[PDB]
Every structure is written in structure tokens, then in C-alpha cells.
């Protein structure tokens, strides 16, 4: 206790009858008082260590608290663990826990903070020797259940994660940085960090993302690979190990800068690759956009068998899924050589099989015609369009169309949009060519423009097997001098091949089809083409595009509306990237206008896309500044300025939309509540600001892909009957599809009630109807959405034209663009390898707001839904495979993936 005679060899035993108490008092005193006794203290280190083990299996708190009170002082606050230095350093095996007994078991906030730091210093230094590693391992695996071990291992490994901070904040590091008081360079870091990874996998699951994100390196995710692949078969089974990982990786997407954010994913693909669930590995490869990643996954699955089996099929269906098309081109190769079949295997690799399931789906759901028939007034315009929009996605619309009477009768620039929407019926399906050639071959150029857009959309179905490809038709039609006819011809092509970039694709769109001497709005469609094709795979933010962006702008700037269209197409090109977008800020800006600076901030939001650490605060300084300066003070040349001022509003809304997509499962839920509030604030500060914010708001919902989709839109939609602008409904309904005729049935019924009671303009009526007919696609037919489906945080490839027109005035002319909406997702079927179009049962889970799961993986419990359903909108998308009951296990794990399910039946 407090006696110096209690240090005798005899007096260990005499003391220990009472209780072991030889360790502190006398011993401590002599070690901290005479150097000579450190030579003795060394041999007795072993003896002491054991006394802590015994009184832990007979754990009793009192006799550590009180006893090792005065012990705290010698260790590091007085001796400072460095006389001749070597001697205290070696004795850090049995004294590190003695510090911890006043850190941990004695409780007080005040002592948690203080001693945390001290421990960090000691761990690190004794992990140079590497004997602190050894102390960690023997608690994780313990020797007996007690309250000791189970707190001690948590704290030790927690502190290492702590250390890396001190060197980043300041150059100084060391004790002056009070965060851990540790230098944090190799020695107790390198050697300790390697052990650290192994420990945190076994019991731990909730400090692991904290370890990975703080380092903020792809080196950390690279060491992690190896460590995890060792344990993945004995300690735990692959199934458990794989989910635990999948929890870590998703969590760290918030709180990482752009260059780090993508780098975290790249490495994550490798972890997946080795791990036996190859399904996950392949989806993330596309998102990244690097062909090489896709190649490896497909080949590994295909080659080991010379028979058909589950293996060939499995490889082939994963490559079919993307409607970007990049996977499709690649996958042809090994399977082709083999000739088990060309007919079957080749087809399932490419997008030929998805067409066929779409046909099947069209018969199942039918296509209940219920289109508006209204003639006359501006109500005429609306009717015509509604026929297209109602029956959006692959259908048979032939009989109504066959009467060209109403198509020609559709007045104005409205006429063009009526033909365009005939084009929309024919998505991802060769069939419907027949109707298009009629309009194309006759009358105004106008009818021909909608028809040509239509060919691009019809050739989309099959473009890898190249059946009546897009390219052939439209090539002839580029040449035709008229700007309208050129431009439309090149946008359908852009859509068809999509994220696919080939020698055929590049050279066609290369000489722009926009007349620089005319500023025709449907001749804007040339820049749209370039934006679309580049996105849907990695974006080099290319220079060829900038040369032309400047070219259209310089020539004509008198029409402000048009030049805003080019600005928006440029920003969109870059999206799907946040790391090369910084580089192109310099490049774009080199040229001088107040107009070029307007473009700068738009593209700025795209750069900082990843987390709200940067994003949310830029779009808030920006927002406040008009409002705040104006509030404070109170309490050709023209046309350039006007663009300037308009873009700031836009830019604030855009940065908010882009950020929330990325965030936490947790963070989505709070940003939504806030968004509604933000409407009141902007309304307070500035009248003008309110108007722009509203229209964007409905797109906020679509872009972020909120979790919910059932209750919230409709709640919001009531409020926005009162708020000005009726484009709020147009953008809002593209989010609000969900299962079709659930939400949307309520959207059409409600909307026409309020418009007939309160009518304030026929223009106003035009929007209300359009939106509501759009919303439903009959009986839950495959839906448009920003996400790919396969990519959970997926950004649009052909669903980005929406935002462009929301910012600018409301006219019938803009609607042409809106016809593009390719976004259709497969109706899943439980396949074996005989390509069965019929499900046992599958579980859907509507709940998608959970913050308990970070993975956002549907709980296995679920609720059972039938066969030949569509993979419904968000808050329904999470689908798990019911199969457990009939002794069956998914090979292809769906977490809410688009993906066709596949099982191995035991």
C-alpha cells in the first residue's frame, strides 16, 4: 500500500493473502525514486502483470480505484517516462492499464478528457517496440468474461484513430497540440495502425468508419483489403463479413473531400472483387466509369466453366442491366468464342433480352387509354401532348396516332412537341418505327423534327446488336441544311448510344448542328447532345466542348434566354465528376464577360459535390448576400447584367440539390424538413428569389431521390397550390411516380379539382394537366427516375434535361426537350438459368428512411408481393429475395438493385 518494506520477495505472499497490493505503493515509490531500483523493477514487471489478471477474473472496482490513485502520478506526470529513457519505456507493459484504471473505471468527464491524451502518448511509443500490440490482442480475445477487458480494448483502439489529427491541424504536433499530445509519425503509428485494422474487424462495427474516414486516404482502404480477406473464411463466414464491409464503405461517402471521395470507391471495388459476392463489385465499377473494372468481373465469372450452368448466365445478366450501354459492348468476347449458344448467350449479354421483358410487361399491365381529348383553345395544345405523356414508356399507341388529323391540327410550336411525344412511346423498343416515318417524310420541317427525335428514342432498345441502328437513319438527316432538322437528328443519336462513346458516336456529334447566326431554341438541342453522351461514364470535362460553348455565346448574347441554355448544358456535362471540375473552372473563365462569371459558380457547385462540409456553406453565403445587403441598407449591356443576377439564384438551388443525394441516410431526412422552411425564409427576404426557389423545389425532390415518395409530395403539393408558379407541379410529379396509380391517382384527381374551381390563366391550366397525366404510366409500367437503379446514388444520363428548363420561363416550346425521359427500369423476375419469367414471391420493404442501417439494405423479414410486378419507386425499391422458406439462397443479392434476381436452389 504505502509501506516501503512491502517490496520484499517474502512480502508479495504475505500481502497477497490480504489482497495483492504489492504492485503500487512501495514498488512505485522505489521505481520513481532510485534508478538502481529500476534494474530490479524490470524482473518484477512479469510478476506484477499477473496480479492484474487474477483480480480481474474476480473483478472488484473498489480495490483498483482507491489503490491505484496515487499510482497515476509517477507514470508520465512526474518521471515523464524518460530518465536514461530506455528503462521506463520497457515497463510500459504493466503500467499502461494502471493509468487506465483512473481513465476508465473511475468516472468523471473531467478525468476522461485529461488522461485520454496521456495514454495516446504511451501507446504509441510502446508500439514502436510492438509489445503494445500484444496487450490489445489478449483483451479482444480475453481469457474470461469480466467488465475489464470489454472496456479496455474499446479505448485503446479509439485513441489511435485520434492521433492522425494532430499532424494535419498543425505542423507543430507533439504536446502543444492537446488533441492527443502525440507526434503521430511512424514508430507507434505505422506498426500500431497495421495491428489496429485487424482488431476492429472482430467485435467492432461502429468505430470502423471513423478509423477509415479520418485517415482520409485510399492507402488505408488498400491495407484494409488484405487484412479482411484473411478472416473472411474461418472467423466468420463470407456472408457476415461482406455486409459489415458494405456498412463501412457507404458511411464514409459523407465527410470526404472530392479527390478522396472517389478514391475511397476505387479501392472498395477491389475489396468486393476478392470477396465472393461479385455482384456488388461490378455495380460500383460502372459508377466510377472505368472499363477495366467491369472487364475483370465479367471474365472471372465466365471462364471457369465449359458448360452452360448458373455461371455463364450470371455474368451475362449483370452486363445487360445498364441502359448506358457501356457494359454491353465490353461483355461480348469470351462468351462469343465459346458458342454454347450465340443466340441465347450473346443476346443476354446485350440489351436484346430487356426489350423482350418490356413487351411482356406491356401485356401484363396493358395501357389503359384515358388521355385528355380536349379541342380548342390552349387546352388543345395540352390534349395532344397528354396522349404522349400518358402512355410514356413502351407501349402500343398505334391506333390513336394513325389519325394524323390532330397532330397537324396542333397549333404553333406546340405542334412540334406533339410529334416529339409520339417518339416517347417507343422507348427501348425497336417497334414503332412505322409511325414515325409518316411524319418524317412530309409537311413542315416541324413534324420532321419530332419524328427524328423519335428515331433516336426507338433505336435505343437494341444498339449493341445493331438492329436498324440509329446511326444509319439520322446520318442522312444531319446533312439537310435547316438548323431544326440537323439539331434534332443529332440529339436522338446522342440518346441512343447513351453513355457509350465510340468512333461512330464521337465523329457524328463533333461539328455542331446549331446555327450561330440564328438563335432558335430547338436548335439549342445540339449542345444537349454533347452533354448527354459524355455523362453516363467518367467525364474528362473535355476541351472540344468548351470551344463550342464559347462559340455560340459570343456570336449572339442579345437573347438572354438562349445563352442560359448553353450555360446549363456545360454544367451538366461535368456532373458525375467533382475532381476535374476544378481544373475547367480556369479554362472556361479565360475569356471575359460578366456572362462568363455567371457560368463560373454553376460549375463550382459541381466541383464541391460530395459532402456538405464545403457545399452547404457556399450555397448559403451566396443565398444570404442579395437578401442581407438589401435588407441592411433599408433598415446589350443591360442583357449581360441580367444573366449575371439570374444565375446566382439558380446556383444556390443547384448546390443544394447536388449535395443531398450524397449524404447520410440520416442527413436526407433532416434536409427535407428544412427545405420546406427554407421556402418561408427566401419568401421573407426577397420577392424575386421566392419565385425561382419554388420551381426548383419540385426538382429538389427528383434529384436527391428522397427516401419517401408516398406521403411527402402530396403534402407539399397541397401547400404549393397557394404559392405562385405552377411549374412546381411539373417538376414535382417527375419525382412522384412511385407505384403508378397509388400516388398518382391522387395527384390527377386533386389537380383538376383546384384548376376548375380556381382558374387564373389557361397557361396555368396547361401546366396542371400536363404534370398530372405525366405522373402515372399505366398500372405501374417501368418508370423514369434520375437513378439508374443499379446505382443507388446514380445520376441521370438522359434525365438531366429536366432541370434545364425549370429555371426559365414557362412556355409550350420547352416541352419538346421534356419528351426525353429515358429512365425505364427492368421488372424483376426470379431466374434460375432457364430464364423463368415467374417469381416464387419476393419481399419488398417500403421503409427506406432507416438510420439504424447505413447500408440501406432491406431487412430480411419483409412483406411478400407477387410475381411480374415492376420494381417500384423509392420507398419500395429495396427488395430482398424470399427464398429462405424453400431452402434457397440468392447468389445475386439485391439491396434494392434494379437487377434481375438469381438464386441457387439447394
Amino acid at each position: 500500500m504505502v509501506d516501503e518494506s512491502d517490496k520484499k520477495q517474502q512480502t508479495i505472499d504475505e500481502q497477497s493473502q490480504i489482497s495483492p497490493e504489492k504492485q503500487t505503493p512501495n514498488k512505485k515509490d522505489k521505481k520513481k525514486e532510485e534508478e538502481e531500483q529500476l534494474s530490479e523493477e524490470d524482473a518484477k514487471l512479469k510478476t506484477d502483470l499477473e496480479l492484474l489478471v487474477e483480480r480481474l477474473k474476480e473483478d472488484d472496482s473498489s480495490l483498483y480505484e482507491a489503490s491505484l490513485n496515487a499510482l497515476k502520478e509517477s507514470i508520465k506526470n512526474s518521471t515523464s517516462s524518460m530518465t536514461a529513457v530506455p528503462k521506463p519505456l520497457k515497463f510500459l507493459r504493466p503500467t499502461y492499464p494502471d493509468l487506465c484504471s483512473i481513465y476508465d473505471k473511475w468516472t468523471d468527464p473531467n478525468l476522461k478528457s485529461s488522461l485520454a491524451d496521456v495514454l495516446s502518448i504511451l501507446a504509441m511509443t510502446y508500439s514502436e517496440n510492438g509489445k503494445h500490440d500484444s496487450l490489445r490482442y489478449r483483451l479482444l480475445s480475453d481469457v474470461s468474461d469480466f467488465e475489464g477487458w470489454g472496456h479496455e480494448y474499446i479505448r485503446h483502439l479509439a485513441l489511435e484513430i485520434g492521433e492522425v489529427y494532430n499532424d494535419q491541424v498543425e505542423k507543430d504536433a507533439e504536446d502543444e497540440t492537446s488533441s492527443d499530445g502525440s507526434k503521430s509519425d511512424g514508430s507507434a503509428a505505422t506498426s500500431g495502425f497495421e495491428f489496429s485494422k485487424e482488431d476492429t474487424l472482430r467485435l467492432c462495427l461502429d468505430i470502423v468508419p471513423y478509423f477509415l474516414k479520418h485517415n482520409g486516404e485510399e492507402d488505408a482502404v488498400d491495407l484494409l483489403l488484405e487484412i479482411e480477406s484473411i478472416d473472411k473464411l474461418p472467423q466468420f463466414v463470407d456472408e457476415n463479413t461482406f455486409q459489415r464491409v458494405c456498412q463501412y464503405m457507404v458511411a464514409c461517402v459523407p465527410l470526404l473531400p472530392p479527390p478522396e471521395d472517389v478514391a475511397f470507391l476505387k479501392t472498395a471495388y477491389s475489396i468486393y472483387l476478392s470477396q465472393n459476392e461479385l455482384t456488388d463489385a461490378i455495380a460500383l465499377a460502372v459508377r466510377l466509369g472505368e472499363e477495366d473494372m467491369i472487364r475483370s468481373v465479367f471474365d472471372a465469372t465466365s471462364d471457369p466453366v465449359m458448360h452452360k450452368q448458373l455461371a455463364y448466365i450470371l455474368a451475362a445478366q449483370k452486363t445487360s442491366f445498364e441502359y448506358e450501354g457501356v457494359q454491353d459492348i465490353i461483355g461480348n468476347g469470351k462468351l462469343s468464342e465459346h458458342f454454347l449458344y450465340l443466340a441465347k448467350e450473346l443476346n443476354l449479354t446485350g440489351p436484346k433480352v430487356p426489350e423482350d421483358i418490356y413487351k411482356s410487361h406491356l401485356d401484363n399491365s396493358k395501357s389503359v387509354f384515358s388521355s385528355a381529348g380536349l379541342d380548342s383553345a390552349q387546352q388543345n395544345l395540352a390534349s395532344s401532348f397528354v396522349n404522349g405523356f400518358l402512355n410514356l414508356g413502351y407501349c402500343n399507341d398505334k391506333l390513336i396516332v394513325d389519325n394524323d388529323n390532330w397532330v397537324y391540327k396542333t397549333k404553333g410550336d406546340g405542334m412540334t412537341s406533339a410529334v416529339a411525344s409520339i417518339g416517347s412511346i417507343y422507348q427501348w423498343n425497336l417497334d414503332g418505327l412505322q409511325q414515325l416515318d409518316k411524319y418524317l417524310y412530309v409537311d413542315e420541317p416541324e413534324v420532321k423534327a419530332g419524328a427524328l427525335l423519335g428515331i433516336g428514342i426507338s433505336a435505343s432498345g437494341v444498339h449493341d446488336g445493331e438492329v436498324e441502328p440509329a446511326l444509319l437513319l439520322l446520318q442522312d438527316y444531319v446533312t439537310n441544311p435547316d438548323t431544326k432538322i440537323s439539331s434534332a437528328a443529332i440529339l436522338g443519336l446522342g440518346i441512343a448510344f447513351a453513355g457509350s462513346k465510340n468512333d461512330e458516336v464521337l465523329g457524328l456529334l463533333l461539328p455542331i448542328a446549331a446555327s450561330t447566326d440564328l438563335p432558335i431554341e430547338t436548335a439549342a438541342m445540339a449542345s444537349l447532345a454533347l452533354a448527354h453522351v459524355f455523362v453516363g461514364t467518367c467525364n474528362g470535362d473535355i476541351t472540344t466542348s468548351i470551344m463550342d460553348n464559347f462559340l455560340e455565346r459570343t456570336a449572339i448574347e442579345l437573347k438572354t434566354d438562349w445563352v442560359r441554355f448553353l450555360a446549363l448544358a456545360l454544367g451538366i456535362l461535368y456532373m458525375g465528376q467533382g475532381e476535374q471540375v476544378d481544373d475547367v473552372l480556369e479554362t472556361i473563365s479565360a475569356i471575359e464577360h460578366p456572362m462568363t462569371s455567371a457560368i463560373e459558380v454553376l460549375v463550382g457547385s459541381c466541383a464541391y459535390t460530395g459532402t456538405g462540409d464545403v457545399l452547404l456553406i457556399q450555397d448559403l453565403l451566396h443565398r444570404l448576400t442579395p437578401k442581407n445587403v438589401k435588407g441592411e441598407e433599408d433598415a446589350e449591356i443591360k442583357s449581360e447584367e441580367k444573366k449575371g443576377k439570374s444565375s446566382d439564384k439558380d446556383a444556390t438551388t443547384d448546390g443544394k440539390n447536388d449535395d443531398e443525394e450524397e449524404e447520410k441516410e440520416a442527413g436526407i431526412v433532416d434536409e427535407l424538413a428544412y427545405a420546406v422552411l427554407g421556402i418561408a425564409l427566401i419568401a421573407l427576404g426577397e420577392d424575386i428569389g421566392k419565385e425561382m426557389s419554388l420551381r426548383h423545389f419540385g426538382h429538389l425532390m427528383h434529384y436527391g431521390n428522397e427516401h419517401i415518395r408516398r406521403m411527402v409530395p402530396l403534402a407539399m403539393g397541397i401547400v404549393s397550390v397557394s404559392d405562385p408558379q405552377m411549374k412546381v407541379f411539373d417538376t414535382l410529379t417527375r419525382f412522384s411516380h412511385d407505384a403508378d396509380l397509388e400516388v398518382s391517382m391522387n395527384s390527377i384527381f386533386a389537380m383538376g379539382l383546384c384548376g376548375a374551381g380556381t382558374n387564373n390563366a389557361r397557361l396555368a391550366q396547361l401546366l396542371r394537366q400536363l404534370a398530372s397525366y405525366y405522373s402515372r404510366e399505366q398500372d405501374a409500367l417501368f418508370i423514369t427516375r434520375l437513378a439508374q437503379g443499379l446505382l443507388h446514388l446514380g445520376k441521370g444520363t438522359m434525365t438531366m434535361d429536366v432541370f434545364n428548363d425549370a429555371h426559365v420561363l414557362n412556355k409550350v416550346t420547352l416541352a419538346s426537350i421534356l419528351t426525353t425521359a429515358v429512365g425505364l427500369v427492368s421488372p424483376s423476375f426470379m431466374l434460375k438459368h432457364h430464364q423463368l419469367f415467374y417469381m416464387l414471391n419476393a419481399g419488398i420493404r417500403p421503409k427506406f428512411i432507416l438510420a439504424l442501417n447505413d447500408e440501406g439494405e432491406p431487412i430480411k423479414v419483409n412483406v411478400r408481393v407477387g410475381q411480374a410486378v415492376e420494381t417500384v419507386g423509392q420507398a419500395g425499391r429495396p427488395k430482398k429475395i424470399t427464398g429462405w422458406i424453400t431452402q434457397s439462397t440468392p447468389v445475386l443479392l439485391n439491396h434494392g438493385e434494379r437487377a434481375e434476381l438469381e438464386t441457387d436452389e439447394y
Binding site: L616, L624, N628
Partner: protein, 47 residues
């Protein structure tokens, strides 16, 4: 400065604090993660 002129300054001070705090909460979070009453007479002459 008279009453009107003194008042411009008093207000200006009030205004800066309100504005300051309206950006402060968020910015701060998100910063770190990513000679004499009677001098009588002097010897010193003056003109």
C-alpha cells in the same frame, strides 16, 4: 454629428451583430470537418 449623425453609427453596430450570428452557427461546424481636468497654464507660448 448631431442626433441624426450619431444615430447612423449606433444602428450600424446593431446591424453587424445580427448579421454575424446568422451565418456563424453553420459555418463553424462545417469549418473543421473537411489628460487633465484643469491644465491651468503652460510656460510654453503659442501664437
Amino acid at each position: 454629428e448631431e442626433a441624426s449623425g450619431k444615430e447612423v453609427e449606433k444602428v450600424a453596430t446593431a446591424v453587424l451583430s445580427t448579421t454575424a450570428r446568422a451565418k456563424a452557427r453553420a459555418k463553424k461546424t462545417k469549418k473543421e470537418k473537411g489628460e487633465f481636468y484643469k491644465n491651468k497654464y503652460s510656460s510654453k507660448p503659442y501664437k
